[PDB]
Amino acid sequence: MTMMSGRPGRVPLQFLPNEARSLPPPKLTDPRLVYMGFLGYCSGLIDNAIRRRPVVSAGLHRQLLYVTSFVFFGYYLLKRQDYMYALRDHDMFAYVKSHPEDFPEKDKKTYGEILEEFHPVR
């Protein structure tokens, strides 16, 4: 029920191991970052609407801070997420390699020699 908590050589509260730096960072126009910025913009607009201020005009410094905070946090969130998926794939490939008797390569047939069952539609 806890697959990656017990992995060896894992620092308790890093959020970003040093090994993560071997991975390409997300581009600054990453559509997920753009969506995080859009979330910040919606937060700014709802903020204006709740306090009965003009919705698109009232606080531009405030809306800018909303957008910037969301983009800033989202960048690091994306880094950590991509790093965790890289760990998953690394471990899966290493395990398949070290246990070849569990992942055998069997000879595959062309469809000319596989007998498939035919079911007429009528």
Partner: protein, 175 residues
């Protein structure tokens, strides 16, 4: 005219008789034909002449697309998606060409039934037999596949038929 191939769309030599009048009365059909000719067929012909004069000035062509022959679904291994994709596209194009072959044969049959008049039951037997052969072949290849058909289902149908035929011939050889 020469636009279409007369081997794919054949027709008999078109025997027509000569007029043999038997009366002094004037034939109103021929007079009406002269009137129609000189009121309709000549202005239309002149208009077409001008149109084709304007066409000849600017002459450009288009080319029929030719498709290579890629490996079919029998020589694709079970989970190879690219071989399967190209084989399935090829099988679909062949299915379309076979539909058009049956269409050509049906056009021949219809033209014969109309042309032969009262003698169509004897004079169109070859057209009928040709259609029967083509229809039998097309039916074996594609009937009962259903919607969501594919090259794999066509292959399974062929293999089932081949198994039945082989077993029938084998038990006929024991007879």
């Amino acid at each position: 005219p020469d636009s279409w191939d007369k081997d794919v769309y054949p027709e008999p030599p078109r025997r027509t008789p000569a007029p043999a009048p038997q009366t002094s009365l004037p034939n109103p059909v021929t007079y009406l034909t002269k009137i129609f000719d000189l009121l309709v067929d000549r202005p239309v012909t002149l208009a077409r002449e001008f149109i084709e004069q304007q066409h000849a000035k600017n002459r450009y062509y288009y080319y029929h697309r030719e498709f290579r022959r890629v490996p079919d679904i029998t020589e694709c291994e079970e989970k190879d998606i690219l071989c399967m994709f190209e084989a399935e596209m090829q099988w679909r194009r062949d299915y379309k060409v076979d539909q058009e072959i049956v269409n050509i044969i049906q056009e021949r049959l219809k033209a014969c039934q109309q042309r032969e008049g009262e003698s169509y039951r004897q004079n169109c037997a070859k057209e009928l037999e040709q259609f029967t052969q083509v229809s039998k072949a097309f039916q074996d290849r594609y009937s009962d596949l259903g919607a969501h058909y594919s090259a794999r289902k066509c292959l399974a149908k062929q293999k089932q038929r081949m198994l039945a035929e082989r077993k029938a011939a084998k038990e006929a050889a024991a007879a």
